[PDB]
Amino acid sequence: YGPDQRAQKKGDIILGGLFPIHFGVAAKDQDLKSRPESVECIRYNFRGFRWLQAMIFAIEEINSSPALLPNLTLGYRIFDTCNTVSKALEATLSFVAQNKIDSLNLDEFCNCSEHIPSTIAVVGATGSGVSTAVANLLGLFYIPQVSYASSSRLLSNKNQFKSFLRTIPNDEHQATAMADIIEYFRWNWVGTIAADDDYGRPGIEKFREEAEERDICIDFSELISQYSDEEEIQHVVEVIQNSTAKVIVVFSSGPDLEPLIKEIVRRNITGKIWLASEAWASSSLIAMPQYFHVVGGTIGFALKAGQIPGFREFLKKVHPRKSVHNGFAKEFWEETFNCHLQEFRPLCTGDENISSVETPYIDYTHLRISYNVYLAVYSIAHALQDIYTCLPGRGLFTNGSCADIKKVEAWQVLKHLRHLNFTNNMGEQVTFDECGDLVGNYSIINWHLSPEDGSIVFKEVGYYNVYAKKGERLFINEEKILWSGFSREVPFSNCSRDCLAGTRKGIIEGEPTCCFECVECPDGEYSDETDASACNKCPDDFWSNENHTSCIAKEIEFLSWTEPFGIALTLFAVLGIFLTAFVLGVFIKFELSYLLLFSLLCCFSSSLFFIGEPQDWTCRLRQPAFGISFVLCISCILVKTNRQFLLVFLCTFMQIVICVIWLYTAPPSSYRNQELEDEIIFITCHEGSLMALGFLIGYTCLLAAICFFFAFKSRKLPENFNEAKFITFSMLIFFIVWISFIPAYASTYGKFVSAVEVIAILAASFGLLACIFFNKIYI
Amino acid sequence: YGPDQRAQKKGDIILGGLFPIHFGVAAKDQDLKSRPESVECIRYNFRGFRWLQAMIFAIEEINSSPALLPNLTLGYRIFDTCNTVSKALEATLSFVAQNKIDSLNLDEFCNCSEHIPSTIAVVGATGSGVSTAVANLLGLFYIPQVSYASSSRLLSNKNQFKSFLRTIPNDEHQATAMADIIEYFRWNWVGTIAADDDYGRPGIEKFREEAEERDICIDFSELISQYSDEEEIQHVVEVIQNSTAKVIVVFSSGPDLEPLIKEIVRRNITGKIWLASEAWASSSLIAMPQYFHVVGGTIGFALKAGQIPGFREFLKKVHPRKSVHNGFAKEFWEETFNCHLQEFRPLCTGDENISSVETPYIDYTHLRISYNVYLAVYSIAHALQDIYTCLPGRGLFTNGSCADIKKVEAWQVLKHLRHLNFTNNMGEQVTFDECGDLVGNYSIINWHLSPEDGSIVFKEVGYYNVYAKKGERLFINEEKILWSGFSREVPFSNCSRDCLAGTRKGIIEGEPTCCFECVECPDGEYSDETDASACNKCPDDFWSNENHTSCIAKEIEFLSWTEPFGIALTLFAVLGIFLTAFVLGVFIKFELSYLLLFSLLCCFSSSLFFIGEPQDWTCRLRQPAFGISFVLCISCILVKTNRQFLLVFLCTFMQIVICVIWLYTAPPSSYRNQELEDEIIFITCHEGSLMALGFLIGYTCLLAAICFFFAFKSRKLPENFNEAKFITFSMLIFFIVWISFIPAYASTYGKFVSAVEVIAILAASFGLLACIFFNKIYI
Ligand SMILES: *[C@@H]1O[C@H](CO)[C@@H](O[C@@H]2O[C@H](CO)[C@@H](O[C@@H]3O[C@H](CO)[C@@H](O)[C@H](O)[C@H]3NC(C)=O)[C@H](O)[C@H]2NC(C)=O)[C@H](O)[C@H]1NC(C)=O
Ligand SMILES: *[C@@H]1O[C@H](CO)[C@@H](O[C@@H]2O[C@H](CO)[C@@H](O[C@@H]3O[C@H](CO)[C@@H](O)[C@H](O)[C@H]3NC(C)=O)[C@H](O)[C@H]2NC(C)=O)[C@H](O)[C@H]1NC(C)=O
Ligand SMILES: *[C@@H]1O[C@H](CO)[C@@H](O[C@@H]2O[C@H](CO)[C@@H](O)[C@H](O)[C@H]2NC(C)=O)[C@H](O)[C@H]1NC(C)=O
Ligand SMILES: *[C@@H]1O[C@H](CO)[C@@H](O[C@@H]2O[C@H](CO)[C@@H](O)[C@H](O)[C@H]2NC(C)=O)[C@H](O)[C@H]1NC(C)=O
Ligand SMILES: N[C@@H](Cc1c[nH]c2ccccc12)C(=O)O
Ligand SMILES: N[C@@H](Cc1c[nH]c2ccccc12)C(=O)O
Ligand SMILES: *[C@@H]1O[C@H](CO)[C@@H](O)[C@H](O)[C@H]1NC(C)=O
Ligand SMILES: *[C@@H]1O[C@H](CO)[C@@H](O)[C@H](O)[C@H]1NC(C)=O
């Protein structure tokens, strides 16, 4: 009863089933003026008819093989749910009719003897919005429902759907796999689209939850349906166009993506790569050749294929007349041959060849969901077998006493179906968990266009092994992947382009972490990585390059010790020492000959002892350059004609006491200065407050000035061949040198702050011997 | 029939109803050894019994007032769904029993005359996981279901739930309101918790979708249930403890938050503020006084209260004996008085006072959902009224012919219920939209503890006007809000603390945009805002401050025009001019008196014409400082005793030709230099390649040196009171000055690169007159 398009066959134990022979109900909506009537289904699903044949075929195989359920035949009352909850509930209200005694004792059948004989276990409700609505009605009467296709995670809640097992993997793994793919191809800017029913809605939240532990920032997220209006479809395609993201993760069903794909083709939005859910990655509505402008390269998923023997030869044995136990055969015949079967449209002779036309009923390469239908009805058969072959004192019920077969109930088959452990025709073990589902391995496919009259071929490009360890589960042989149909290079679908090794990452306000700008950082930056979020600072003896990469450029070494700028002045000091020694020899052979020669040679020999990079001793040894000058300027008071002479320690010991007092105040330490930035590693010796200045003013500007007022009366007096005149000329040379010293010493730094003093001491002590020794010798 | 705890009363038109008298079914799960039986409900819901009394009371009011539905009495078959889909489906399978002809013609009642008289419109299914499961079964038979409490957005899909209207607002507005509150209090780091059924799951996705257009980054998102296990509850409280976010948006129901709230109290996780959904913000399971350590200050929502007259006096008229049409009264009596009614537990006399004990059945301050029950049954009455008072040729059905009352069907009441426009007892208009719901205004409450024996009082702190414009809908009078129970200051719940105006925002890799670090930016930074994501760069005449805020510090103005460093040298130049003029007057009164006085005064008067900030003319007027020196040094060849003399243009015109050729090569333009960074706005005049150097070497070092070999034979020759000797002394002064000029000119910059040349010209031209004019005058 119920609907009047059944597929019915009597038997001892009646199964029942629910299959999607059409794709939907008609678009007519009632205004409720007239009394409402049953809505008529519109499209046709040859894949759904193949699923129905796979159920019926395995029931004939169980009734054929006598090693499984002997002297007991299986019937079935297979209905058709046109992918709608109402058409499914009209069927599963006729499934539970004899069981409807427990609340309504007022059934009292009164229209049949066996009273619509009680279904033991229903196999069906493909959609997950349909299984959720049928498993609520098959949960009061405890009839087990073994669904072959519904694969949402809401149905794995065994406090509400108390009797629901399924032979298709959960979708907690597929939303992990679609994040592993996006992580593996190094994308971080994707968008999601999900069908608004119980399949896409809790299956895109798992992808959102598992693509933010990988940094898979989501761009947009829209929900579609198969009954959405034109404003909603236009809004979804405007969000697709208004964005810049090439990976679109579509977690939807077959005919829910149809109004979006039609309109995206009609508006020609090319470039995106569609990661596909399992429900539409092998679909005879989206894989159509004229959609291949926008739908190509769609890396999808598919379940593990099966092998059913004799099934393809059983599919061709169909007929609208020889099949008396199949009410859908006439509708399939008329829809596949464009006939009109008589018992615009020509009358059908009924002698056609089924292998002649091209249709998804017989043009298939792998059984994937049809094998799940076969496996579900074999699961119910292998539970009825264990009820059949149970010995007393051994079973599963209370006190081990198992139940009979001739009066078997639905909850006993549910109890045995929970504890199921059997083997297929492929040697695999099938067992339902505590949440009642199987576990399987996905085989990632790709959408290629066959270049000889073929529609679309699905080329397998890897797997997804769910048994392996977390992290190593995905294998993508990416030399078979044709990006957007024809290309070969992996497309760029990041948000902002990853900047180079000279720049850092700077963010925009109101945009995610996955989108930045990239600016350069200054002054000791050294962005050593490629995408560093903050470039560091260099060590103090290093400075950044021109391209702002790793700072291998060190700072200065400004010393000029043996350089060709200081070595020539050292040669001048050696020439002064040699010219002094050649006069000392002529003064020895041929106190003003001992001290005013020895300290005079010291003032020109220790003046070469202030070059190079200074240190503690080379920074404390600047005091002899004045202490020896104060003793070598004693000739101006010792060689005069106004001459008890060995009391030069009335000034030399004063200078020595000044030096011994000032060596603690002006410290014996070079001080490295930071005046420039790039190459500024200095050494400047940092005289304290007044020490060397007071020492110079009290010796080298005081003795030569106290000699000045004493020799100004003798400058116009020649004596001993004008010795006073030559002393005054050397004193004028010394005054010119000490006038030239101080401003050039004040207005220089570093390399040129010592080369003024060391040149001025040379220029004074060379004149103070060349004006005097030559005139005293050559006369 | 169905369940054997009904509330039944016969009548002409039977309504039906579904109410949550208990809170859930017992925790016993079947192992299916025994034959499974009906599970027994556990807790009690006095609020649910108040809702049942509000339905029954309005049915008595319709049967009482003769102005509404006269000569026609309303019955009801009210059942009890213990918040479970299975207990609701056992009831709504006994609602549709006479309507079960359309698919099963084999009903053929055979146990009643009227055959369980057909319910016209059911009122119930409070939960939104229960209304979704009952509206699928009341959508084949087109019975209208007017739910009073289910408020999810999945039920507003009129292609699947074809007959479902409701008198509670949708939850597309409440998830907007909870984002408006978080935006209004300036939070950006929240966490969400949602009950895993059809209420929290599509209601937290709307909050996630509307709290990322406001930048409301989400921290965590967990799903709970009332059947969750201890590992899941421990995981949720470990995510709450392991996070740092104080705003927790709980979108859940009453008894779904119970195992989380119990365990959070048992582990004492204090500090969080719980934004509440409407379902538990006024709940007699969470608002309990011992939970107030962690549950306080919970800014919730509540619907608009109603006024039902006579209802509180009707509630006290209940009795287990006088109520013959109410099967729940004995259970309510026994559960509220701890009795055991006879027809551990003492026997009940049945003479107690209902207003004596404290219970949520009678301790209420505002009718919110009870008014919705009243409004739903008045909606069905005001649709039956319009079927009653329809004139022919005027109705809503086909060709205007409306239907009778004595044979009325469910789809006619559905048609009239769609077109409903009536008025309450409060003067408000009630009309269902095209998606079949009402619109209402929320009244935001807060959870205060009453400090005299009270449990928890709910103090209203504002509203949420959904009729107003988008953006201005929320009004929070925040001087009534007690944060976490007692406090008064708004709590800080951002991710990272907003940094100051000296620093920028730097990001962390692997963390959202809402969390940053804050580093300082250098060298012309001027972070003018408070939380700028990138600090700008200053204009070139400005440099950054010490605190790196807005750069008001301008650069240098190094000129020294009228400063106390250049004005004293200008006074020295004026003194040189005056001392030259006083000698010119004594040479006039008492060509070497004309040219060697006029050009000599020019060389000391135009030497003050090179001070200040230079410009085109003040940078081209450096050439007279050599052109006048070459003409004023002509005295050294014009005043000698070896003296056709007016051919000084054999050198002065050569210098003039050099200047006229070099004024284009060395350009007349000051060049601003950038040698330092902070205060470095310079002017340096940028001599070209060799122009001034060659001019100086060809005039001022050439004439004085060609005079040298001519006057070296006359230096030992006194003539005209030693004029040659005084000329040689002035030439030695000039040679000393031009030896002191060049190194101090080379080793300075800017302010000290002109003050060396302008001092050296003064020192040369003062000596070249003071050595000569004084000896020529005073003799
Ligand atoms: C889109 O943005 C992505 C950021 O999420 C980029 O992903 C980055 O790719 C890098 C390779 O180009 C990865 O570097 C790897 O780092 C690990 C250590 O973390 C090393 O062992 C690997 O050797 C190294 N890879 C190579 C080739 O050297 C980054 O780790 C990775 N970022 C993250 C967060 O994982 C994408 O590159 C970018 N897209 C494009 C096209 O550039
Ligand atoms: C948590 O982070 C939030 C960032 O999302 C901070 O929110 C910022 O608060 C500022 C006020 O303190 C807002 O400034 C306002 O800016 C508008 C113009 O955009 C002006 O008209 C207002 O006058 C100005 N407010 C004041 C008081 O001057 C920021 O706009 C706002 N950020 C955003 C993105 O809106 C929170 O402040 C922060 N929490 C705490 C406690 O600081
Ligand atoms: C799951 O997928 C994997 C890979 O696609 C399959 O694992 C292989 O199984 C064969 C047969 O046992 C082994 O010889 C290989 O070594 C396996 N590959 C590995 C471990 O990488 C497996 O057949 C699939 N199906 C199931 C049910 O596990
Ligand atoms: C919705 O909420 C608002 C504010 O809580 C209420 O609006 C006020 O209504 C009264 C009566 O009409 C007016 O006098 C006020 O001016 C309104 N306030 C405004 C416009 O800010 C309103 O009563 C609530 N209910 C409905 C059904 O709108
Ligand atoms: N899991 C799918 C059902 C499904 C799997 N494969 C399919 C192929 C076609 C149609 C539906 C399916 C759903 O929830 O809807
Ligand atoms: N909308 C709630 C129903 C509800 C509203 N208020 C309530 C108060 C108590 C219990 C349930 C409710 C839900 O979907 O579940
Ligand atoms: C798309 O972008 C245009 C231009 O900014 C804008 O006008 C339009 O509203 C956008 N549409 C959507 C859906 O964002
Ligand atoms: C869509 O665009 C592609 C490439 O731009 C082009 O080949 C194709 O013909 C277009 N189709 C339509 C219908 O505009």
Ligand SMILES: *[C@@H]1O[C@H](CO)[C@@H](O)[C@H](O)[C@H]1NC(C)=O
């Ligand atoms: C043993 O089995 C009988 C019926 O088979 C049952 O009534 C009884 O309770 C059982 N006893 C135990 C201890 O299991």
Ligand SMILES: *[C@@H]1O[C@H](CO)[C@@H](O)[C@H](O)[C@H]1NC(C)=O
């Ligand atoms: C039962 O199933 C388990 C795995 O689920 C398997 O290891 C075991 O071999 C099965 N039992 C038998 C008897 O095959």
Ligand SMILES: *[C@@H]1O[C@H](CO)[C@@H](O)[C@H](O)[C@H]1NC(C)=O
């Ligand atoms: C909480 O933090 C601790 C310490 O880092 C960690 O060991 C634990 O696994 C965390 N738990 C969760 C649920 O994040």
Ligand SMILES: *[C@@H]1O[C@H](CO)[C@@H](O)[C@H](O)[C@H]1NC(C)=O
């Ligand atoms: C929980 O903590 C609060 C404050 O720390 C304290 O007042 C209260 O007594 C605690 N309760 C328990 C059970 O530890």
Ligand SMILES: *[C@@H]1O[C@H](CO)[C@@H](O)[C@H](O)[C@H]1NC(C)=O
């Ligand atoms: C008028 O009404 C009759 C019955 O009331 C109906 O059969 C007929 O179709 C209607 N005609 C029009 C034009 O509405």
Ligand SMILES: *[C@@H]1O[C@H](CO)[C@@H](O)[C@H](O)[C@H]1NC(C)=O
């Ligand atoms: C019908 O409802 C509208 C608003 O929905 C209201 O404006 C109008 O007044 C109502 N009709 C009557 C007759 O009150």
Ligand SMILES: [Ca+2]
């Ligand atoms: Ca398909």
Ligand SMILES: [Ca+2]
């Ligand atoms: Ca934003």
Ligand SMILES: [Ca+2]
């Ligand atoms: Ca409650």
Ligand SMILES: [Ca+2]
């Ligand atoms: Ca991260």
